[PDB]
mmCIF file of C-alpha atoms and ligand atoms in Angstrom:
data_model
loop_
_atom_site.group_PDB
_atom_site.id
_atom_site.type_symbol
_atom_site.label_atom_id
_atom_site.label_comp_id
_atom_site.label_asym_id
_atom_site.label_seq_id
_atom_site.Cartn_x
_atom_site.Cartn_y
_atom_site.Cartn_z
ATOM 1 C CA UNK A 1 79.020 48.310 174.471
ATOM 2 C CA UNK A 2 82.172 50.367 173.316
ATOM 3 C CA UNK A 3 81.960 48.497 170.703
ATOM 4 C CA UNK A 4 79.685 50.481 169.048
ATOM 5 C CA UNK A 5 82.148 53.418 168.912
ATOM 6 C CA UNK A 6 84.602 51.829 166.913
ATOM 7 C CA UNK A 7 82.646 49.738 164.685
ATOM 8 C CA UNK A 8 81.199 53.681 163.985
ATOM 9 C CA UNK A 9 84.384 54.772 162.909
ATOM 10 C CA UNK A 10 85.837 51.813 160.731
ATOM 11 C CA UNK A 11 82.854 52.210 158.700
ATOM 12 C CA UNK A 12 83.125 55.530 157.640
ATOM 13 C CA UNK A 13 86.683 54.809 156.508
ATOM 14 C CA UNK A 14 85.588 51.601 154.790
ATOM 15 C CA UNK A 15 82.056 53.704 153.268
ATOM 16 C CA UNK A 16 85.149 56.485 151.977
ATOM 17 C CA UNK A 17 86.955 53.672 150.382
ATOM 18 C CA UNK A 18 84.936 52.129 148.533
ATOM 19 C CA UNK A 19 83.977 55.586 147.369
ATOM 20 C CA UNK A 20 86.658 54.863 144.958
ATOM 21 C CA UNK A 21 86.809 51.235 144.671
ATOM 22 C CA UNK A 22 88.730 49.715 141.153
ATOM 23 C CA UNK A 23 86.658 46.726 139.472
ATOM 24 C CA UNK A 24 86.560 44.772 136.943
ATOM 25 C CA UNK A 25 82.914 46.708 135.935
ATOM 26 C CA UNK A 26 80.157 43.638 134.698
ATOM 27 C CA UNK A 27 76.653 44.431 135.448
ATOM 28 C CA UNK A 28 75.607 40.749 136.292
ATOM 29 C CA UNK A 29 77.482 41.331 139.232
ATOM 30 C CA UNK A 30 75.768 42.246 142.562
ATOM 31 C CA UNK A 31 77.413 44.750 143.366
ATOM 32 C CA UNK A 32 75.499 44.705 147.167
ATOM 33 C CA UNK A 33 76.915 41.329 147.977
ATOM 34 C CA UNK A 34 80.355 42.297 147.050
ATOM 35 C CA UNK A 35 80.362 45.138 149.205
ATOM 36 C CA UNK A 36 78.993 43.103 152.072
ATOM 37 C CA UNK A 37 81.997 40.624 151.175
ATOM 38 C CA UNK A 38 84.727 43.384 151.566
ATOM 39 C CA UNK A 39 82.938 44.888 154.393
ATOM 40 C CA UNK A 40 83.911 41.336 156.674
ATOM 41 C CA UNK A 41 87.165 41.738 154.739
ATOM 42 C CA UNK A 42 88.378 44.990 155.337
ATOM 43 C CA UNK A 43 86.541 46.308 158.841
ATOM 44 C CA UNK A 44 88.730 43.296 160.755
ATOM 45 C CA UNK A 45 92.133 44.828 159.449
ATOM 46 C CA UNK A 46 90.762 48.876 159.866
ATOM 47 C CA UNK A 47 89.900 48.180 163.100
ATOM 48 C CA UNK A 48 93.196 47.286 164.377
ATOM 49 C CA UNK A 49 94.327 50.717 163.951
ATOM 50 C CA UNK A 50 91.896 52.071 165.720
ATOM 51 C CA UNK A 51 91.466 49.555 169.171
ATOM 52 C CA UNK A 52 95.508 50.246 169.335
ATOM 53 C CA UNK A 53 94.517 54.305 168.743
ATOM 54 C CA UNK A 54 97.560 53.895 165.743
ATOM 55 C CA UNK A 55 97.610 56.473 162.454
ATOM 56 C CA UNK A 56 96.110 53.899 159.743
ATOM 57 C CA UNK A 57 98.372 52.858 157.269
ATOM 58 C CA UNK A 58 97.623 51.988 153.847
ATOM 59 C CA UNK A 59 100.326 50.438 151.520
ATOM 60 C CA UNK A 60 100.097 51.354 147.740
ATOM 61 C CA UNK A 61 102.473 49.768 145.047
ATOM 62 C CA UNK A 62 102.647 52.335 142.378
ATOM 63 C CA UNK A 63 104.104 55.179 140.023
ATOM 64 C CA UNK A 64 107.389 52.755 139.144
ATOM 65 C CA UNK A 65 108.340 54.453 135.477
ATOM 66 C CA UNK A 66 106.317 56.693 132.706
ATOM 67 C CA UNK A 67 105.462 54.674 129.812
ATOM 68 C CA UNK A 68 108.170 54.829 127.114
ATOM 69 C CA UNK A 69 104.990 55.091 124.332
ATOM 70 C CA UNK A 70 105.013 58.614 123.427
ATOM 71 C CA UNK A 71 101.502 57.488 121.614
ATOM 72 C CA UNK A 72 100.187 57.304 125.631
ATOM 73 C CA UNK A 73 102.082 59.077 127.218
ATOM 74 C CA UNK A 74 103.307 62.998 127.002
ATOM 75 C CA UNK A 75 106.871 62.673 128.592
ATOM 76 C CA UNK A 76 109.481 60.942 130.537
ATOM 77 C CA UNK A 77 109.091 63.159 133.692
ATOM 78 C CA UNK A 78 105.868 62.835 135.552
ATOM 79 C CA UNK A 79 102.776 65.014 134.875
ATOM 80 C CA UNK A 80 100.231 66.811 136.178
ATOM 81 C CA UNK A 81 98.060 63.531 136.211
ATOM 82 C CA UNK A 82 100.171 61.802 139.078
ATOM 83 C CA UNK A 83 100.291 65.620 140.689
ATOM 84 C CA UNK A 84 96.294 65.308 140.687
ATOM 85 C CA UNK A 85 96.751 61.501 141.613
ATOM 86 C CA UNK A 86 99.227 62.138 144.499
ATOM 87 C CA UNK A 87 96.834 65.230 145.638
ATOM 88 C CA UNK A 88 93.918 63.388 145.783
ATOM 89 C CA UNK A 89 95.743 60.581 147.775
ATOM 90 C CA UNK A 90 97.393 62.846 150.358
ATOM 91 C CA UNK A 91 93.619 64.588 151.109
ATOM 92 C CA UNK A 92 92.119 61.121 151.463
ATOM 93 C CA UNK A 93 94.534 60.842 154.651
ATOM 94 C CA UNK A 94 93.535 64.660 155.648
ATOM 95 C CA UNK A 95 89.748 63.381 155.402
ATOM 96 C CA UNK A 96 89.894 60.792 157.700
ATOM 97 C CA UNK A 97 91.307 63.001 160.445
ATOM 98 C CA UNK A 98 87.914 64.256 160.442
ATOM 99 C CA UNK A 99 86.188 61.609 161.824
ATOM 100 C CA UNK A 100 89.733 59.827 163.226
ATOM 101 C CA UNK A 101 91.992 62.448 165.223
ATOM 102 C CA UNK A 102 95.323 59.828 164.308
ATOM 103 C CA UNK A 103 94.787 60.546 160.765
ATOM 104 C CA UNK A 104 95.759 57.683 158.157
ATOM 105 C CA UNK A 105 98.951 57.660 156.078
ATOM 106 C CA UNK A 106 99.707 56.121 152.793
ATOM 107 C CA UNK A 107 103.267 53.936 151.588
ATOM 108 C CA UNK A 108 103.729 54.260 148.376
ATOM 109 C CA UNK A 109 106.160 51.770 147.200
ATOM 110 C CA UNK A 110 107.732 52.667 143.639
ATOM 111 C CA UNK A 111 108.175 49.285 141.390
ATOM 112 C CA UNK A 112 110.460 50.794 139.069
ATOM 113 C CA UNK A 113 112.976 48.952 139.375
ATOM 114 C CA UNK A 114 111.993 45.312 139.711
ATOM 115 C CA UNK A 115 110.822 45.398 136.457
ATOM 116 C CA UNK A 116 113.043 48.360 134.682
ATOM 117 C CA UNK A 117 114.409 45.528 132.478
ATOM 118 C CA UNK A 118 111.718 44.161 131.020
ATOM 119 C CA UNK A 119 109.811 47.477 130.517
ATOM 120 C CA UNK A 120 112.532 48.429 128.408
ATOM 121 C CA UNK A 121 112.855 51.891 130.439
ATOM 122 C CA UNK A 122 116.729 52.778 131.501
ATOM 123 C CA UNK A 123 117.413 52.087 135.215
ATOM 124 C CA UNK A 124 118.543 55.791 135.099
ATOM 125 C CA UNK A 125 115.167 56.665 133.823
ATOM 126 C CA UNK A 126 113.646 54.945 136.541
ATOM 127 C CA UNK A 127 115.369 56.586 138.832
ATOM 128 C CA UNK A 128 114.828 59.924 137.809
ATOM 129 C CA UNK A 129 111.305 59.370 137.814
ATOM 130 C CA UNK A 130 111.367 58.335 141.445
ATOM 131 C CA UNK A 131 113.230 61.547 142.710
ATOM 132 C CA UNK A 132 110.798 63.345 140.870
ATOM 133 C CA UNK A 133 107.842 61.798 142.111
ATOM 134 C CA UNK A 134 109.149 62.485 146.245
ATOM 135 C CA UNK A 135 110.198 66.132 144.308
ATOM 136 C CA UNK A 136 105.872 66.588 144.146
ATOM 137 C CA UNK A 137 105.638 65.394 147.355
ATOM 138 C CA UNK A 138 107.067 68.319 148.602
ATOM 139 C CA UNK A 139 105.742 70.691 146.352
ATOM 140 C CA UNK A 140 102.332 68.811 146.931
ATOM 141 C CA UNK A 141 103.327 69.091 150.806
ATOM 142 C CA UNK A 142 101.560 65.648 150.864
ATOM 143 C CA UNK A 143 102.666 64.812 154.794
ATOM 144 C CA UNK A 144 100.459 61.871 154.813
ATOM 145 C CA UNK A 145 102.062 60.192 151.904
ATOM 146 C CA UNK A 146 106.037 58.219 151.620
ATOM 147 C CA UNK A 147 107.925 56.511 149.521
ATOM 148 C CA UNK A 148 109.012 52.898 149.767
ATOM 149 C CA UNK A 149 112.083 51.162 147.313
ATOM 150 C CA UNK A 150 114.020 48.755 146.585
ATOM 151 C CA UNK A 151 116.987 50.054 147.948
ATOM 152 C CA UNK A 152 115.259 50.650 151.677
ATOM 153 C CA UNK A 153 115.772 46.841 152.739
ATOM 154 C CA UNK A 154 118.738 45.992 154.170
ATOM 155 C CA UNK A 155 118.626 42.300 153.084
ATOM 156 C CA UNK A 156 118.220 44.034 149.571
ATOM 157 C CA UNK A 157 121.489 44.157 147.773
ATOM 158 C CA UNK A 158 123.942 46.056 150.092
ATOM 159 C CA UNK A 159 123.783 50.236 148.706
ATOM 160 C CA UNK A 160 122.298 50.749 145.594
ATOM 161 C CA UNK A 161 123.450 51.011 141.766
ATOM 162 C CA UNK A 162 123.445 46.861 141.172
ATOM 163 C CA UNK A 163 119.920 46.883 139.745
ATOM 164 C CA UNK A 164 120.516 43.532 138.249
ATOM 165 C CA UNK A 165 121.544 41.955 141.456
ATOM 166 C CA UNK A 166 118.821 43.611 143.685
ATOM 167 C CA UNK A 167 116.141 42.079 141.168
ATOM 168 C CA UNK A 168 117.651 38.873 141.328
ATOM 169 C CA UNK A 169 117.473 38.698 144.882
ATOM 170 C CA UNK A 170 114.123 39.716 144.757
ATOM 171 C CA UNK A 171 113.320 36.962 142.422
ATOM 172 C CA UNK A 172 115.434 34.570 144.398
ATOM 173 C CA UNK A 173 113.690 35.332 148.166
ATOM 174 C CA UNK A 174 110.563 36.226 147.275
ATOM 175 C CA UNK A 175 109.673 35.179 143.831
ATOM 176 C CA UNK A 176 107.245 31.958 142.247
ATOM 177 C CA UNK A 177 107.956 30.412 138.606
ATOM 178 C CA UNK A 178 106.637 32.046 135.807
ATOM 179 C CA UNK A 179 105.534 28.366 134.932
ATOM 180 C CA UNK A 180 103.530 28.232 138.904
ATOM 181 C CA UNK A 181 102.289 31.991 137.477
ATOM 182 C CA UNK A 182 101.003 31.153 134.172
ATOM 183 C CA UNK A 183 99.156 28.030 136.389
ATOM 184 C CA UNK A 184 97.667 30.429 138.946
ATOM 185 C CA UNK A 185 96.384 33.085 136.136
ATOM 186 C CA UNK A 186 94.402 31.037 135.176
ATOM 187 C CA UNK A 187 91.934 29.415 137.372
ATOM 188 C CA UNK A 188 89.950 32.686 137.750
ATOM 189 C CA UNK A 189 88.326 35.492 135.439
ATOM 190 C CA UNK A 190 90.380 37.208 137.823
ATOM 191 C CA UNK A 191 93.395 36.028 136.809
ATOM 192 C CA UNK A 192 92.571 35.563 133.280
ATOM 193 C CA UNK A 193 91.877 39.289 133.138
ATOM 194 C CA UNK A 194 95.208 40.754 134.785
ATOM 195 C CA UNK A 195 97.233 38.423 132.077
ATOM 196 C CA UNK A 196 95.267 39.778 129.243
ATOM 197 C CA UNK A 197 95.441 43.424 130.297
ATOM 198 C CA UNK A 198 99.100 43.195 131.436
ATOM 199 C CA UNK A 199 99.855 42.126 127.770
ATOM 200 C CA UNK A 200 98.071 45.058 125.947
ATOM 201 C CA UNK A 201 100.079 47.379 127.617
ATOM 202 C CA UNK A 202 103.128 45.810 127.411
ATOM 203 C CA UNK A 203 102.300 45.016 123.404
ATOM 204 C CA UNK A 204 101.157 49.033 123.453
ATOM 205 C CA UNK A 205 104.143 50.178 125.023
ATOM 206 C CA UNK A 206 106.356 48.836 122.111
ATOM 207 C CA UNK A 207 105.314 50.023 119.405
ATOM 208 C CA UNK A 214 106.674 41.441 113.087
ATOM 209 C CA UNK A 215 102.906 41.390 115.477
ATOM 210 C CA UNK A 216 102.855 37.499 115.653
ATOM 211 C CA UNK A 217 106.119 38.005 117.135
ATOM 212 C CA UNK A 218 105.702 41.203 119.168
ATOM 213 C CA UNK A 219 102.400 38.937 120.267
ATOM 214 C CA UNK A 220 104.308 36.244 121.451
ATOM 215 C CA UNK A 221 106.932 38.684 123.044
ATOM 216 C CA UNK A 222 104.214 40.564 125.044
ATOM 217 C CA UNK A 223 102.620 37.374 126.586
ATOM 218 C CA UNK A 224 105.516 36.612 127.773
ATOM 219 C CA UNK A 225 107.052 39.538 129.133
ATOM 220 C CA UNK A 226 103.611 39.883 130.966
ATOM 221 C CA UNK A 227 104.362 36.394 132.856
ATOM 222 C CA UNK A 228 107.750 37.935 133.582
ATOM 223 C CA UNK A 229 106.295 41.248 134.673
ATOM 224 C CA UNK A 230 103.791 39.692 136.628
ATOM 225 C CA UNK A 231 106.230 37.340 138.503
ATOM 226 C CA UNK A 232 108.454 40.465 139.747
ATOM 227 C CA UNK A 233 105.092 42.172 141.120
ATOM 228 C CA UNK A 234 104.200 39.438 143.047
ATOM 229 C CA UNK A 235 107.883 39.467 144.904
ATOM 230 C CA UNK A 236 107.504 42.996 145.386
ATOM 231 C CA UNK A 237 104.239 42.406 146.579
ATOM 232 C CA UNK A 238 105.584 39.177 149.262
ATOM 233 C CA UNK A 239 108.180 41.782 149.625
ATOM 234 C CA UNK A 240 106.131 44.778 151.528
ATOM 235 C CA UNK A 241 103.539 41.659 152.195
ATOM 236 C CA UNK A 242 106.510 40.838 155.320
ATOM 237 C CA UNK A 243 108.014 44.357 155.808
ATOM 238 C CA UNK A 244 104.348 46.110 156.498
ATOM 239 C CA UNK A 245 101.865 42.734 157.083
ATOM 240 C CA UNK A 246 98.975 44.535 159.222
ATOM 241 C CA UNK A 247 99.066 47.156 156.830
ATOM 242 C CA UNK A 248 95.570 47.810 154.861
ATOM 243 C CA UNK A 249 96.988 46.993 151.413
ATOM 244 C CA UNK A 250 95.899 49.131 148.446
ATOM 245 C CA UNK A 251 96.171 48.138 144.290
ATOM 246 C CA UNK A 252 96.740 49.900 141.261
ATOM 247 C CA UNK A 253 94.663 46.879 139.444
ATOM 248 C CA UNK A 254 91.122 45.791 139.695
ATOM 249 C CA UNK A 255 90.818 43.345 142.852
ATOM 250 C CA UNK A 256 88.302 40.837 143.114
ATOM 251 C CA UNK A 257 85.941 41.528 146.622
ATOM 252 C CA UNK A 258 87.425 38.436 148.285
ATOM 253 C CA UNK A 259 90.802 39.546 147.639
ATOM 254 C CA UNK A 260 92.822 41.338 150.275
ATOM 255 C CA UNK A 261 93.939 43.791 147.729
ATOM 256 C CA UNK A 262 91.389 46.977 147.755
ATOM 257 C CA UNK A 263 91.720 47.983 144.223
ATOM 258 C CA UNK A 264 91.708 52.106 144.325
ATOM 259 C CA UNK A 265 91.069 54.852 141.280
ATOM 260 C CA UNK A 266 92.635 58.194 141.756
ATOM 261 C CA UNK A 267 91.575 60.249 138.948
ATOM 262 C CA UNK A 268 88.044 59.597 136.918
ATOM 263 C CA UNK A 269 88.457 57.538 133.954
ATOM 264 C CA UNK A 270 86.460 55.204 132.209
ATOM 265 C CA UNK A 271 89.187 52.595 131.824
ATOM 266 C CA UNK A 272 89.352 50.410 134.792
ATOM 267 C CA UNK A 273 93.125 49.743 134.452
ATOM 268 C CA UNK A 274 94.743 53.031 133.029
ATOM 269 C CA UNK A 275 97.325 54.733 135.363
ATOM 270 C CA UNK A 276 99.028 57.806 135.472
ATOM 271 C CA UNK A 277 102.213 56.678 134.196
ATOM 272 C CA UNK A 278 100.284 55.476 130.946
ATOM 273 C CA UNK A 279 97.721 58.124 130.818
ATOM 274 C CA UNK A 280 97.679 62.562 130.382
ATOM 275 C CA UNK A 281 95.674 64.403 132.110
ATOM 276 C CA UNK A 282 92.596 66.135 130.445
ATOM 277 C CA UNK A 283 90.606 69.424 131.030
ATOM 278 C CA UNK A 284 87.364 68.186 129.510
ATOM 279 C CA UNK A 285 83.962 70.088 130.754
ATOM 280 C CA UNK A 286 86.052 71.301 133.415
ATOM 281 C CA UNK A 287 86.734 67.760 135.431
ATOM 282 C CA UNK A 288 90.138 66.617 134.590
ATOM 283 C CA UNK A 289 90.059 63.254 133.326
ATOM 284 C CA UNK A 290 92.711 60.189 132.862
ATOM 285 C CA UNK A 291 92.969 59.365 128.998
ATOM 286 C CA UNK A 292 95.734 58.033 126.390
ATOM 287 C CA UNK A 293 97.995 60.821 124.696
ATOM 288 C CA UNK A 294 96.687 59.657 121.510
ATOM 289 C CA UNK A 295 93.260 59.373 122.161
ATOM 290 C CA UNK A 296 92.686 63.099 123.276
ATOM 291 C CA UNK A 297 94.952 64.594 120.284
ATOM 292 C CA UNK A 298 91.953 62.707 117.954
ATOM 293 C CA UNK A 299 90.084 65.174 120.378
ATOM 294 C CA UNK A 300 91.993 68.230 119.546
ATOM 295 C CA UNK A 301 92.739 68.768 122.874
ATOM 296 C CA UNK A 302 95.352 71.893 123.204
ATOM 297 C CA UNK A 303 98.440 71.011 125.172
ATOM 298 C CA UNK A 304 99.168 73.396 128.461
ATOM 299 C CA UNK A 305 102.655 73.813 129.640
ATOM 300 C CA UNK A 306 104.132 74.212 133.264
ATOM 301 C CA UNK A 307 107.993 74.941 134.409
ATOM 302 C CA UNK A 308 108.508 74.568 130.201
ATOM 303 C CA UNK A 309 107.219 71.458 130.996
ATOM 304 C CA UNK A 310 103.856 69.508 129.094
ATOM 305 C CA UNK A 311 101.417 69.145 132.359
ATOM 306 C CA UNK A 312 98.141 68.400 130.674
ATOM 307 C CA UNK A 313 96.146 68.961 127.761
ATOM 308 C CA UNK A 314 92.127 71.051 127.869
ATOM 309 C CA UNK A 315 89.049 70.530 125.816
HETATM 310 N N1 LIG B 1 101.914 48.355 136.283
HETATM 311 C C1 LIG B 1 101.441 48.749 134.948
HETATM 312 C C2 LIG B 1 102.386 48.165 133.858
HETATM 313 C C3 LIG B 1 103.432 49.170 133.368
HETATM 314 C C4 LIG B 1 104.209 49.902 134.270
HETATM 315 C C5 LIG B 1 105.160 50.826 133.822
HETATM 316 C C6 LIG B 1 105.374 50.993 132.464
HETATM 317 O O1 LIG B 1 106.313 51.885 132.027
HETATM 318 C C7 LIG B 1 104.659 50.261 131.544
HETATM 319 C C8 LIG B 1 103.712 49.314 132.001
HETATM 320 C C9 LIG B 1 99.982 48.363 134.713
HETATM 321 O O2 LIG B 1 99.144 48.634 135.582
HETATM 322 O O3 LIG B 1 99.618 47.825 133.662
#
């Protein structure tokens, strides 16, 4: 039958993906089977692109604010390592016009400000970091790629500049309780493993350590709980979008976990990481980490891009 043509092309898409799939790496794990499990997963909601001959559309919550830990981190403004991020995104779309004349495009939806207060990162920061992240765009001349926020929905609080009210609405209309978060955490590895991760980097990020402790297990629960509205938030405004993570996603999950740099940490972004000449492959590591390196620092538009070893 016919088919056969578009089960052909989903696959390659789906065989591209997972090209660069996130996990949560553990050798006892089959990795076959999951793949087999995401394949029934992901093929269903690829496929309605293609039957309706559509672009396919991808939705990505990420970049919301550099990390305020100049120990990670190199500066406020963005670096090179979201420039090679972005890059690599934008091509992804290019690729699939190769096999799939329509192309795909990508949503990236900043979370900078849901959670600006508890980050402890100014909501002028945040801002500032947004502009400058559609600024690469441009440079970048990533067509494929766009930016979602906060202030785009119109049931979102009416303009913009009322932070504080737009995240309580979010809260309000879209939000669980922290206390049916903690619950749902966990039941799984899964969920065990986001809580404990979402900590270190919160505990990371500021810096009395059995009260700092304390403090980062619960900001994560707060964190975590303004995600998830985001997340119900673009879950309504784009649902038969193909949804892409920032985090490690189990195989059942409809999240598709995605990398977009090499690194050997599973959840390091660009926003917590600097970018790194190493053998010539640019790599995704911790400020602090590559100075122990002696990695030399390389500056672009008097700016610190990345560092090379
Ligand atoms: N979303 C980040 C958490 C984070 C985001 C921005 C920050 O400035 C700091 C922490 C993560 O993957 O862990």
């Amino acid at each position: 039958s016919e088919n056969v043509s578009l089960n052909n092309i989903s696959m390659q898409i789906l065989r591209e993906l997972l090209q660069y799939r996130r996990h949560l790496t553990d050798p006892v794990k089959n990795s076959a089977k999951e793949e087999e499990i995401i394949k029934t997963v992901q093929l269903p909601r690829i496929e309605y692109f293609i039957k309706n001959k559509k672009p396919i559309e991808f939705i990505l919550p990420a970049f919301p604010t550099k990390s305020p830990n100049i120990n990670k981190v190199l500066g406020t403004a963005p670096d090179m390592a979201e420039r090679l991020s972005l890059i690599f995104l934008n091509s992804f779309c290019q690729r699939i016009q190769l096999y799939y004349p329509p192309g795909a495009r990508i949503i990236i939806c900043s979370d900078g400000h849901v959670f600006g207060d508890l980050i402890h990162v100014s909501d002028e920061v945040i801002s500032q970091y947004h502009e400058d992240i559609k600024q690469l765009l441009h440079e970048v001349g990533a067509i494929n790629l766009s930016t979602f926020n906060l202030n785009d929905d119109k049931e979102l609080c009416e303009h913009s500049d009322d932070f504080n009210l737009q995240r309580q609405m979010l809260v309000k209309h879209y939000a669980r309780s922290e206390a049916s978060i903690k619950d749902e955490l966990l039941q799984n590895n899964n969920g065990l493993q986001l809580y404990r991760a979402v900590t270190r980097f919160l505990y990371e990020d500021s810096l009395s350590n059995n009260a700092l402790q304390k403090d980062a297990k619960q900001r994560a629960i707060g964190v975590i709980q303004r995600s998830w509205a985001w997340g119900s938030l673009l879950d309504t405004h784009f649902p038969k979008a193909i949804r892409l993570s920032i985090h490690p996603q189990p195989a059942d999950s409809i999240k598709f976990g995605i990398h977009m740099m090499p690194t050997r940490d599973d959840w390091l972004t660009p926003w917590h990481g600097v970018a790194a000449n190493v053998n010539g492959q640019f790599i995704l590591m911790k400020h602090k980490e590559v100075q122990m390196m002696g990695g030399k620092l390389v500056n672009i538009h008097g700016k610190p891009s990345h560092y090379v070893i």
